[PDB]
Amino acid sequence: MDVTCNIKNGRCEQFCKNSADNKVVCSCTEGYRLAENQKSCEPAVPFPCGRVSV
Amino acid sequence: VVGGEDAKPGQFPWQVVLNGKVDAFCGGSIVNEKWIVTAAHCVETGVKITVVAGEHNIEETEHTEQKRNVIRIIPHHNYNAAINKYNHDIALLELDEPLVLNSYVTPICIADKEYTNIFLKFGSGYVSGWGRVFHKGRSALVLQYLRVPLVDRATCLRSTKFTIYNNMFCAGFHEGGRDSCQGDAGGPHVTEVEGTSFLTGIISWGEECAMKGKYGIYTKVSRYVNWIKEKTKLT
Amino acid sequence: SPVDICTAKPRDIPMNPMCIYRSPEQKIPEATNRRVWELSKANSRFATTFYQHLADSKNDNDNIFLSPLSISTAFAMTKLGACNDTLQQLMEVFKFDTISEKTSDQIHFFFAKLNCRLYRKANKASKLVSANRLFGDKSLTFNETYQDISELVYGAKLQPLDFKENAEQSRAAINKWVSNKTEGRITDVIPSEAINELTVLVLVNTIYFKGLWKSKFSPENTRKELFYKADGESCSASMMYQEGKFRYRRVAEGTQVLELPFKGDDITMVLILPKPEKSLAKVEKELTPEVLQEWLDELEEMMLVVHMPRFRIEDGFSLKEQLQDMGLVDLFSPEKSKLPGIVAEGRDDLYVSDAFHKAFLEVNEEGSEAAASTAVVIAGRSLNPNRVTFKANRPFLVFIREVPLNTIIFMGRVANPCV
Ligand SMILES: CO[C@H]1O[C@H](COS(=O)(=O)O)[C@@H](O[C@@H]2O[C@@H](C(=O)O)[C@@H](O[C@H]3O[C@H](COS(=O)(=O)O)[C@@H](O[C@@H]4O[C@H](C(=O)O)[C@@H](O[C@H]5O[C@H](COS(=O)(=O)O)[C@@H](OC)[C@H](OC)[C@H]5OS(=O)(=O)O)[C@H](OC)[C@H]4OC)[C@H](OS(=O)(=O)O)[C@H]3OS(=O)(=O)O)[C@H](OC)[C@H]2OS(=O)(=O)O)[C@H](OS(=O)(=O)O)[C@H]1OS(=O)(=O)O
Ligand SMILES: *[C@@H]1O[C@H](CO)[C@@H](O[C@@H]2O[C@H](CO)[C@@H](O[C@H]3O[C@H](CO)[C@@H](O)[C@H](O)[C@@H]3O)[C@H](O)[C@H]2NC(C)=O)[C@H](O)[C@H]1NC(C)=O
Ligand SMILES: *[C@@H]1O[C@H](CO[C@@H]2O[C@@H](C)[C@@H](O)[C@@H](O)[C@@H]2O)[C@@H](O)[C@H](O)[C@H]1NC(C)=O
Ligand SMILES: *[C@@H]1O[C@H](CO[C@@H]2O[C@@H](C)[C@@H](O)[C@@H](O)[C@@H]2O)[C@@H](O)[C@H](O)[C@H]1NC(C)=O
Ligand SMILES: [Ca+2]
């Protein structure tokens, strides 16, 4: 192996999908955008779901 | 919630309370500005419901509350109280005026069925609500929350003579003392992933509350995510 | 002999009155003496009429609590020695005039029998203490046969006191006797200046009651909640709460009727809570024995949530004016009173100067732990918006009765449970 969604979730903060030849495609839920690192998820709206902001 | 603790204002911004002929009879979760997800046994078509988001203390004014009237009640199509008041225990409520999202009013995230189940299997979720703090006791004034561990199916089936369908999961403590209770149904069971909370279950039923050898039974949300997304789409 | 009144027969201790009265013209309870039952029924007829007169003499904003049975028994002790018009009025006012001849002639004995029965049952379902006695001026010579009968059926002989020359000391003595006998629970039954040098005979009947619930309230569920008084104001009361199966019924105009039993089930408390907007005052005047009994017959056991405040009511009052308005006149008249059975007819007048009652009710969470239910059933976690709720956060009426007999032992009004 090496890089599959099956190991540490492809390093994806949220969602992972196996691409071909040792690569994965990370993704986030609504209200979020894949960060610069192509692995993390960052707020794309003022109040994204599931987060405490108080 | 029995044996839980006081939430802090804004700690569970997706939590809402449902008020009817009796106040705080059930809870719910914000899907988006116009929709709430709750338990089907909490609602009846044609019966009015008021939703309050941004709620903390149900007997005081915090200036964070947003009250809305429900204009459409959608129990899951497979729900049928006559053939069990708790299988497919999930329903959607459409609000009259959209909620205004802010720090005290924020939706809960809902992943696809694959990940919702993966998150549930992380084994630890949070339940919250204004339900009773003691079996047959008083409803909470301040929102309560409790961390509950997932209980393997084998163990649950053996803990009750009642049927635990594939659309349900069990969570709680073998020793008793902490559990969701009456008044909490419809509220969320969420799993926090890297700071982002996802809806993994709906508080549904049990045999009394917080009793030794008994667990809270929850609606397995992964099985209904497609239906939720389809019905609540504003797009 | 050491006769035990509670297991005695009228013939065991001959105690016939000097004069007897003869009028011009549901099913019996289980294991019950019919004579005791007819006496209990008479008390209820008296109770409803007396309460109306009492309420009228009080302010609707104040609490009320009394034992009509205690009052009926006390005056039956004057009946024992009364004659002519004094006797007739006593019989009519207390509704004794309809009972059978033997029960009437031995009425003081059957009251003892009735009180014996109720005390036995109450003593296992609550903390109940009482102190009853007649006090007369020392200058008079009391009929010793009356004194012997009184000691047996009433628990004490009439106590001679020097009202003429030591009124204040006499007052203190009476209050001390009552306090001492009620373990300090009932104090100052006779207020200052209530008796003086012209006082001849006074009746004193006092009682304290603190029941033990069959299904107790858990203290963890008691918290401060607002109680809305009739004066438009609200106050902070300690409100008990519990969910359980209780006999209940919502009657005409939305009035809620709830029965909460005490240990043993024989003695219970009945609460009458009118809907908001319907004054309790209206329900008091608008309610005859028939109606109340009808409601009690319609009660059905059902799961509900009960909110009830924990409180204490101390109610002490003179009975003279109210009874006179009800028709009891001669007994309180120096010239008209005829009580030859207590003091032989003579130059000195023997009449009742006044009668004092003081009742104390205490209500809290204490009682037996709720019985564990062994019914395997699924419980949805909704609170159930269609559930029945009895929230006593506004004025309500209270009744404490013995179920089989249907005896009204205590009755009252909780207008303000706050401190
Ligand atoms: C002119 O007519 C009128 O006057 C005459 C003469 O009166 S006088 O003597 O005062 O001058 C009356 O005739 C006299 O009175 C009779 C009467 O029945 O009253 C009779 O009384 C004597 O005998 C009866 C019967 O005894 S028994 O052994 O056969 O049962 C007795 O009454 C019984 O008392 C029982 C008791 O223990 O209290 C009752 O038990 C039931 O209730 C108890 C619980 O009581 S409680 O509710 O207070 O707690 C329960 O125990 C827990 C029992 O459980 C078993 C119950 O029994 S059960 O079957 O229900 O389960 C009996 O209930 C049936 C009750 O039956 C009547 C009476 O005791 S008393 O009631 O306390 O007075 C007893 O009195 S006595 O011993 O002192 O005499 C007299 O017999 C001698 C009779 O005298 S006579 O023969 O010379 O005439 C007239 O009454 S009557 O017409 O005969 O009925 C009277 O008519 S009227 O009433 O004026 O209209
Ligand atoms: C002191 O009190 C006594 C208790 O009442 C009283 O004795 C009772 O007196 C009556 C009559 O005075 C007796 O009944 C007799 O009289 C009636 C009617 O006059 C007759 O029809 C009856 O047959 C009967 O003979 C009671 O029987 C009697 N009871 C008892 C024994 O105490 C005294 O008279 C009182 N003392 C005085 C004289 O002042
Ligand atoms: C008081 O009563 C005396 C006796 O009256 C008779 O006996 C009583 C027990 C009743 O049965 C009554 O109907 C009988 O007439 C009278 O002699 C006496 O005058 C009365 N005193 C008054 C007028 O107050
Ligand atoms: C005070 O009371 C003493 C005992 O009275 C009895 O016991 C108390 C606990 C109550 O139950 C009461 O009803 C009983 O009568 C008497 O021994 C004592 O004499 C009384 N005080 C005096 C001197 O009058
Ligand atoms: Ca609030």
What kind of architecture, by CATH, is found in domain B1-12+108-222?
Beta Barrel (2.40)
Least CB-CB distance to B41: which of C377, C382, C387? C382
- How is residue B137 written in tokens? 């006791």
Helix axes C144-154, C68-79, angle to 10 degrees: 160
Residue among C341, C313, C304, C316 nearest C398 (CA): C313
Per CB-CB distance under 8 Å, the chain B contacts of A14 are: 111, 115, 193-194, 196
What type of residue is C253? E
Q: Which residues contact C4 (CB under 8 A, 6 or more apart)?
A: none
Q: Which two tokens stand for residue A6?
A: 């099956």
B63 Cα to chain C: minimum distance (Å): 22
Coil, helix or strand at residue A33: strand
**Is residue C132 a contact partner of residue C77, using CB atoms and an 8 Å limit?**
no
Structure-block tokens of residue C331: 């007994």
Instruction: Identify the domain containing residue A10 by its residue range.
Output: 1-54
Rounded (to 5) percent helix, strand, coil in chain C? 30, 30, 40
Structure tokens at C28: 């019996």
> Which subunits have 3 or more CB–CB pairs within 8 Å of chain A?
B
Instruction: Report the alpha-carbon distance of residue C250 to residue C271 in Å, rounded.
Output: 12
Residues 6+ apart with CB under 8 A from C308: C217, C239, C240, C241, C260, C271, C363, C390, C392
Angle CA C58–C61–C62, to nearest 5: 60
Is the Cβ–Cβ distance between B170 and B89 less than 8 Å? Answer: no
Distance of CA C246 to the CA centre of its chain: 24
Rounded to an integer, what distance in angstroms lies between the CA atom of residue B215 and that of residue B127? 13
Q: What is the DSSP letter of B107?
A: P
Exposure string over B70-106, b if 16+ CB within 10 A, otherwise e: beebbbbeebeeeeebbbbbbbbbebeeebebbbbbb
* Minimal Cβ distance to A29: which of B103, B105, B109: B109
Contact assessment for residue C107 and residue C79, using Cβ atoms and an 8 Å cutoff: yes
Question: Is there an atom of ligand 2 within 6 Å of C61 CB?
Answer: no
Terminus-to-terminus CA distance in chain C, angstroms? Answer: 50
> Between β-strands C159-161 and C126-137, what pairing exists: parallel, antiparallel or unpaired?
parallel
Count of all residues that appear for chain C in the document: 419
Residues of C in contact with B86 (CB under 8 A): 378, 380
- Provide the phi-psi class of A6: left if phi over 0, else alpha when psi is between -120 and 50, else beta: alpha
Kind of pairing between the strands at B15-19 and A15-18: unpaired
Experimental resolution (Å): 1.7
Integer angstrom CA distances of residue B137 from C244, C246, C307:
11, 16, 11
- Tokens standing for C57? 């003499």
Closest CA to B50 of B66, B63, B37, B74: B66
Q: Residue C275 and residue C270: Cα distance in Å, rounded?
A: 16
Question: Which chains does chain B touch, 3 or more C-beta pairs < 8 A?
Answer: A, C
Query: Per DSSP, what are the bridge partners of residue B38?
Result: B91
Identify which of C6, C9, C15, C40 to mutate to test ligand 1's pocket (most ligand atoms within 8 A of the CB): C9
Take residue A1 and report the two structure tokens written for it: 């192996």
3-state secondary structure at position B93: strand
- Rounded Cα gap, residues C171 and C182, in angstroms: 17
What residues contact residue C6 under an 8 Å CB cut-off, 6+ apart? Answer: C112, C113, C116, C120
Residues C70 and C47: their CA atoms lie apart, in Å, by 11
Longest Cα–Cα distance of chain A, Å, equals: 43
Degrees, nearest 5: CA angle C60-C364-C292: 50
Q: Do chains A and C touch (3 or more CB pairs under 8 A)?
A: no
Alpha carbons B131 and B133: distance in angstroms, whole number: 6
Determined by: X-ray
Q: Cβ(C387)–Cβ(B26) under 8 Å?
A: no
Q: Could you tell me which residues are beta bridge partners of residue B75?
A: B91
Residue A8: partners with Cβ closer than 8 Å, 6 or more residues away = none
Residues near C190 by Cβ (< 8 Å), separated by ≥ 6?
C171, C174, C175, C202, C204, C356
Of B88, B123, B122, B128, nearest in space to B108 by CA: B128
Calpha distance B66→B53 (Å, rounded) = 5
Q: Would you say the CATH fold of B13-107+223-235 matches that of B1-12+108-222?
A: yes
| CATH number of the domain where residue A30 is located | 2.10.25.10
For B140-196, the three-class secondary structure string (H helix, E strand, C coil) is: CCECEEEEEEEECHHHHHCCCCCCCCCCEEEECCCCCCCECCCCCCCCEEEEEECCE
Close Cβ partners of B83 (under 8 Å, ≥ 6 residues apart): none
Pairwise CA distance, residues B52 & B74, whole Å: 18
Q: Are B95 and B28 in contact, with CB atoms under 8 Å apart?
A: no
Task: Tell me the C-alpha distance between B161 and B84, whole Å.
Answer: 14
CA distance C291 to B64: 50
B45 torsion bin: left (phi>0), alpha (psi -120 to 50), beta (else):
beta
Give the ligand 1 atom nearest the CA of C12: 78
Cα distance between residue C170 and residue C168, in whole Å: 5
Under DSSP, is residue C105 helix (H, G, I), strand (E, B) or coil?
A: helix
Q: In b/e form, how buried is each residue of C235-244, taking b as 16+ CB within 10 angstroms?
A: eebbbbbbbb
The crossing angle, in degrees rounded to 10, of helices C68-79 and C34-57 is 110
Helix (H, G, I), strand (E, B) or coil at B63: coil
- Name the one residue in this structure whose structure tokens are 């201790």: C13
- Spell out the domains of chain C, with CATH numbers in brackets: 9-212+309-365 (3.30.497.10), 213-308+369-418 (2.30.39.10)
Q: What's the CATH fold of domain B13-107+223-235? A: Thrombin, subunit H (2.40.10)
Q: DSSP state, C367? A: B
Q: Is the Cβ–Cβ distance between C399 and C261 less than 8 Å?
A: no
Query: CB of C244 within 8 A of CB of C370?
Result: yes
CA of C84 to the centre of ligand 3 (A): 6
Q: Give every CB contact of residue C245 below 8 A, 6+ residues apart in sequence.
A: C301, C302, C303
Q: What CA–CA distance (Å, rounded) separates C414 from C396? A: 5
| Residue ranges of domains in chain B | 1-12+108-222, 13-107+223-235
Would strands C201-211 and C354-363 be described as parallel, antiparallel, or unpaired? parallel
Number of domains in chain A: 1
**Token representation of residue C78:** 């004057």
For chain B, counts of helices (H) and of strands (E): 3, 13
B204 close to B217: Cβ distance less than 8 angstroms = yes
